[PDB]
Amino acid sequence: MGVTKELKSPGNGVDFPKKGDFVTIHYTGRLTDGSKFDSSVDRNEPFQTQIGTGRVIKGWDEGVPQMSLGEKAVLTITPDYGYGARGFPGVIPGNSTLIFEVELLGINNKRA
Amino acid sequence: HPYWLPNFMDVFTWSLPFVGEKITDMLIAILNIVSASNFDRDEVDRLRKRFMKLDKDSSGTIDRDEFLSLPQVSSNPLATRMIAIFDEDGGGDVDFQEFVSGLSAFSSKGNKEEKLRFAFKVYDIDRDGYISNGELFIVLKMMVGNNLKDVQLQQIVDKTIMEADKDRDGKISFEEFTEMVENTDVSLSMTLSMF
Ligand SMILES: C=CC[C@@H]1/C=C(\C)C[C@H](C)C[C@H](OC)[C@H]2O[C@@](O)(C(=O)C(=O)N3CCCC[C@H]3C(=O)O[C@H](/C(C)=C/[C@@H]3CC[C@@H](O)[C@H](OC)C3)[C@H](C)[C@@H](O)CC1=O)[C@H](C)C[C@@H]2OC
Ligand SMILES: [Ca+2]
Ligand SMILES: [Ca+2]
Ligand SMILES: [Ca+2]
Ligand SMILES: [Ca+2]
């Protein structure tokens, strides 16, 4: 519903993030017209966060734990699981669906 | 390889939503002159009871250890900044006048100017009224950790200062800061959401 995940290339199928785990991710974010608004790949700097604890938008907290270590997927996130009516200033309009290409590179100390 | 924020945005627009989120997260944890504050006399009295529970040693002041006693505060990347800002006289601890004054800025009854001032104080570590290059780097680094390289943070700090520093002294005054952020929703970031 709020986030849909499309698997593009599989991970190891056995290791999945649990609530409270720290994940390492390479991502590219796009609006629905396909335009890129941000990418950790382009700055050669993976993104790390604790997952499942509200430190990122709800679409990530709910979508990322579905991925197995090493998976590449696309998360499609509705505004209720993203930045809502406000959007994110300078970057994301209000009422925006978001498309993230996500590669799960690490779960705690485990690396893909 | 040059780095810029999405849409070449400035670091204040970029960081203020997270600043407001993290501080209001801590205020929620804590909540669960005085006569000129944004609180009626009744609400002030409720805060007196909240203050008393936090002061574990009955000093009339809350120190750093009593703030960090909350799990929601100790895990928070802006805990040190919030504590320093609440300590208005700079004496190491927050009395009740400082407790109420700090919370009053985040009221839905507060004005844009005092929320701009609180936001500015997040970055102005040494309280001299100017955000220096190093202060802006340090405070952004506190929030981003290893999610940007130091050289990437240096490029966007330097570009934002070049854009905001109207009189070209290498620092950002309060007036330069408020002009930089005049078309973003700073009040919203710096408000604890009302039921
Ligand atoms: C001092 C800097 C601030 C600090 C910035 C960093 C650590 C650098 C880090 C790479 C973020 C990027 O910086 C280039 C940039 O990434 C985006 O482009 C993006 O692809 C995105 O959507 N991401 C990032 C990757 C995880 C999912 C999502 C996110 O959850 O991001 C989170 C986010 C914005 C949550 C908001 C916060 C405000 C609430 O009100 C709102 O509530 C609904 C939810 C980020 C991680 C915050 O937790 C942390 C920060 O903000 C945003 C479009 C804007 C964001 O810049 C801010
Ligand atoms: Ca005390
Ligand atoms: Ca004090
Ligand atoms: Ca200063
Ligand atoms: Ca200046």
Author numbering:
A (entry chain B): 1 to 112
B (entry chain A): -50 to -19, 31 to 193
The authors write:
Calcineurin is an essential virulence factor that is conserved across human fungal pathogens, including Cryptococcus neoformans, Aspergillus fumigatus, and Candida albicans. Calcineurin is a serine-threonine specific protein phosphatase that is a heterodimer consisting of a catalytic subunit, CnA, and a regulatory subunit, CnB, and is activated in the presence of calcium and calmodulin. FKBP12 is a member of a larger family of proteins called immunophilins that bind to immunosuppressive molecules and mediate their activity.
The mini-calcineurin construct consists of the full-length CnB subunit fused C-terminally to the calcineurin B binding helix (BBH; A. fumigatus residues 335 to 370, Homo sapiens residues 337 to 372) of CnA, lacking the CnA catalytic domain present in previous structures. (C) Protein expression construct of full-length calcineurin subunits A and B and mini-calcineurin containing CnB and CnA BBH linked by 17 amino acids. The root mean square deviation (RMSD) value for the overlay of the A. fumigatus mini-calcineurin was 0.90 Å, consistent with previously reported values of structural similarity.
